[PDB]
Design a protein around this ligand. Structure first.
Ligand code: CMP
Ligand code: CMP
Ligand code: CMP
Ligand code: CMP
Lengths: 143, 144, 143, 144
């Protein structure tokens, strides 16, 4: 089914100058960007967004990196988007990422892994509403 | 010096699924996207943005096309960005556009010419302020 | 229970210069404004927001009035907010509105009735997400 | 002539539950709110907004207070709005504030002085552009 999922190009992705290349990976696989906004997250925004990891030992580092510079927030729409997105991104740890994935091609380490994608449809709903009004999301037909 | 200019990927750009290709054209040339927002313009927003051409015969059609679908608004930053942006975009009329430019590679007609870029530094300041708060624009370093 | 509901000060409310008076009505009754944004709705936004009335005969007029000028969008937080808000607003038709209500005091007619409030908690969730990101809503304590 | 100026209702204003009272002070004086947005400022936003006072000894405390809770950002429009706004707000130090002004009626101390208003027209232009796109500002007529 057609689903909507959240994608975030992390600070390292912008610094590497590959925003366009990452978006093209999605577009060519049928994941249509229907919302996009470059933003610099505050500490409160990063902490609230990653609440599910608050008990994890990497939480503090994740938050500091996520606010180290601006990120590109996006909503991708497409067939089985939640899973398709994660496949395209590749393993969380670049070392284990498959060839041709965003993380294998551009990520430096597990901490600076270039992208985030919602892990489930339930989480996607929450993550999207966290950063986008419904009025900021616009589908359009492909020609 | 380092300047900022406005770039808009028109509805036809999104419909052809080439948002990434266009952004890459800028990144590879050293024009850094420091603000990006996909938005669906209202008639009032388009008319206000293109007010200078209100006395033009194509104005009405321009507005209808500009509100026919969503667009991607962007602020590009770099050395002589206003001019560099115009070089990368190519001639307003795709037919007259040079090889390798965005309009020559992606545009279909003068009306559906894929992108808009501020024509001068004075206009850039106005176009940027029209669509972005200064707090929505963020520079960052380029590093691998 | 503490709930969040959507409130909209319609074009006529701004034209009458009573934005502050309306907000004070809420504040003094314990309905805390936790999100506020002045905005000029486009036709598509008004139509999508009032989708539930698309089959009604007043739909077209409602949409035209709602885009006639800017409005103030707000999220109110408080005890039994959905119902409390509607009580404070008063009857949809100013003619039947109770004394002391926003509509009795400021509304001109059923068409230009100054305010909108979500009619239910289910609708509140939808209306709020339509106009606000979760990151645009901020609770604060009263002192 | 008709000007636009920035007004910020500081954290203490929201905590006392007087957002409406303050906005009414402006409306009753003919200062029309043409842009309004409740927002929680980040440290970077506050520091950037108050950069001129970075060499001041109270700067650090100013920033902490300005990010301690959400604020209401507004653009006011009217004849000689910049000056009219300053009259309504009253002296920066509530103690020195005249009767009937916002600071005399609501402020607690110089640090917790309830509102900020642009001090000049030049600054207003900068402060407004910092927090609002031109497309987020909308004038309307006053009529019953
Ligand atoms: N060992 C770890 N397991 C999972 N994620 C980790 C770990 N260490 C760091 N992280 C990071 O924490 C992030 C949380 O979600 P992301 O999808 O953004 O990607 C994750 C990784 O970048
Ligand atoms: N005769 C024309 N000359 C210039 N602009 C035109 C003409 N016909 C249509 N247009 C469009 O009007 C637009 C005005 O600004 P753009 O930079 O968006 O690009 C222009 C063209 O796409
Ligand atoms: N007879 C009607 N019944 C209900 N709402 C009406 C009617 N005619 C016009 N309306 C308007 O339609 C609006 C829809 O929801 P509101 O709460 O915004 O308030 C309603 C009234 O302003
Ligand atoms: N000694 C001081 N002189 C001026 N501003 C001060 C002083 N101490 C604290 N401040 C605060 O610093 C703020 C700077 O701009 P505001 O208009 O927000 O109002 C000012 C006061 O609230």
């Amino acid at each position: 089914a057609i689903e909507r999922t959240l994608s975030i190009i992390k600070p390292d992705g912008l610094e590497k100058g590959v925003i366009g290349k990452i978006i093209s990976r999605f577009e060519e696989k049928g994941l249509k960007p229907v919302a996009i906004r470059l933003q610099h997250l505050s500490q409160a925004q990063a902490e609230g967004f990653y609440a599910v990891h608050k008990a994890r030992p990497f939480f503090k580092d994740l938050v500091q990196f996520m606010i180290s510079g601006p990120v590109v927030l996006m909503v991708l729409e497409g067939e089985n988007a939640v899973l398709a997105n994660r496949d395209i991104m590749g393993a969380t740890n670049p070392a284990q990422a498959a060839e041709g994935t965003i993380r294998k091609d551009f990520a430096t380490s597990i901490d600076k892994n270039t992208v985030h994608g919602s892990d489930s449809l339930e989480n996607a709903k929450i993550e999207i509403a966290y950063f986008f009004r419904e009025t900021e999301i616009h589908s359009y037909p492909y020609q």
